[PDB]
């Protein structure tokens, strides 16, 4: 009849069970794999920086001179 939350608070157990339905945890003991995630994010940032740079340059060069006036210069 003891509340579940009260029993969980008053009984700190070493064996902790997570959901694990869509995220399979690493076995207890293996080191955290944070370098791999950071490098995946780094590749994504490579991609995002490329897109931002090309968009900015596209807008600037569109506002720049055009082929018609460039050719009329001779």
């Amino acid at each position: 009849e003891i509340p579940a939350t009260v029993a969980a608070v008053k009984n700190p157990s070493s064996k902790i069970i997570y959901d694990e339905h869509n995220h399979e945890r690493f076995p207890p003991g293996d080191p955290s794999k944070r370098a791999f995630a950071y490098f995946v994010l780094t590749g994504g940032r490579f991609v995002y920086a490329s897109l931002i740079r090309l968009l900015v340059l596209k807008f600037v060069l569109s506002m720049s001179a055009s082929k018609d006036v460039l050719a009329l210069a001779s």
Binding site: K58, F59, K67
Partner: protein, 386 residues
């Protein structure tokens, strides 16, 4: 706590931005369908920037509009990319707005607290329709000119002041240079009104909170917006970017009409005058019932029904996930809207006109059946009680 400085987000310079974009609590169970508001905002920003950079090479004159557009395409470095981005992004902006509206319809994101949010959304829809219409008139193509002529001729439907209104809007006795300049000025002006309306939209929603797929009262399980919903919105933005690049770099003119590349000839007329694909449901609603004043009244009734949708009562169960009948009604509505849009791109032959007449009736039957179902299902708990 205020004695000495803390995290700069809490400072007054960034206090409002923090409260409305970083620390704002949102339900943790929001699906990918909730990123469409931010995606529509991104589409609007893209349209504003691209149009601002197109207006530097566009001349709103009947003798120079088409030539200026072609100059943007050919002579301007990246101008073809600019105009393709603008047109196809207007198309994607309407796509994501339609997805926004239909997700709101499914999850009843309008019912009691977000009535003002829904009304502001309807105003935004009107503003987008007008802005896209004027922008399509801007290139001064054959289809653009004749669509402008026809759609403004709808304004000659008020029995008293219809002719005066249409003549005043035309700037004369026919669509001409005055109409082109008028539409250019309006098409530049409205997107900033659209930005203001979008800001009011976001603020009105932030007054109460975002709805969730369950439709239940979601305040016990909420998370901060930034660390968790900026990444989901980023996934949505990248997927939309892939779609947008696909439709720009490989199928640019598929969504457009080929007749818009013919210079506007007032003497001749295209065999089939059809508006843009995202005005097709409204055009089909117009042409369903045979009349002109009747069609304008039907369009006004459509918008009045959209405005009056949130004000129905006894919709205690919000989400359609717990309403089988309402889910079926919504899916029938979506099929009806797709069929209506398809009909809008067809002639006025017998099967097409019959189906258009039926489709509009189903469209309004949705707006009646929803209050009927709410009132009927208000007494569900007493009947199924166990």
């Amino acid at each position: 706590i205020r004695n000495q400085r803390f995290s700069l987000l809490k400072e007054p310079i960034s206090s409002t931005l923090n409260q409305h974009l970083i620390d704002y609590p949102t339900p943790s169970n929001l699906s990918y369908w909730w990123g469409f508001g931010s995606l529509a905002g991104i589409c609007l920003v893209i349209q504003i920037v691209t149009g601002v950079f197109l207006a530097m090479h566009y001349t709103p004159h009947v003798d120079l509009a088409f030539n200026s557009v072609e100059h943007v395409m050919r002579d301007v470095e990246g101008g073809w990319l600019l105009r393709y981005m603008h047109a196809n992004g207007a198309s994607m902006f309407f796509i994501v707005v339609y997805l926004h509206i239909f997700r709101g319809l499914y999850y009843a994101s309008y019912s009691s607290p977000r009535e003002f949010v829904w009304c502001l959304g309807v105003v935004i829809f009107l503003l987008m329709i007008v802005t896209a219409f004027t922008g399509y008139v801007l290139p001064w193509g054959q289809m653009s000119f004749w669509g402008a002529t026809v759609i403004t001729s709808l304004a000659s439907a008020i029995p008293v002041v219809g002719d005066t209104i249409v003549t005043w809007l035309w700037g004369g006795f026919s669509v001409d240079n005055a109409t082109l300049n008028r539409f250019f000025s309006l098409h530049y002006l409205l997107p900033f009104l659209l930005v203001g309306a979008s800001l009011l939209h976001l603020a009105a929603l932030h007054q109460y909170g975002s709805n969730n797929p369950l439709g239940v009262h979601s305040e016990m399980d909420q998370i901060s917006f930034y660390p968790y919903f900026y990444v989901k919105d980023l996934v949505g933005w990248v997927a939309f970017a892939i779609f947008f690049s696909i439709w720009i770099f490989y199928a640019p003119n598929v969504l457009g009409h080929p007749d818009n590349y013919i210079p506007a000839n007032p003497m001749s007329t295209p065999p089939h005058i059809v508006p843009e694909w995202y005005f097709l449901p409204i055009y089909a609603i117009l042409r369903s019932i045979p009349d002109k004043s009747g069609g304008v009244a039907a369009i006004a009734l459509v918008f009045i029904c959209l405005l009056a949708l949130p004000f129905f009562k006894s919709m205690y169960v919000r989400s359609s996930s717990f309403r089988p009948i309402y889910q079926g009604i919504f899916w029938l509505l979506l099929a009806d809207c797709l069929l209506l849009g398809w009909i809008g791109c067809q002639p006025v032959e017998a099967p097409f006109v019959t189906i258009g007449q039926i489709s509009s009736f189903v469209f309004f039957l949705f707006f009646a059946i929803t209050p009927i179902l709410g009132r009927v299902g208000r007494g569900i708990p007493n009947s199924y009680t166990t």
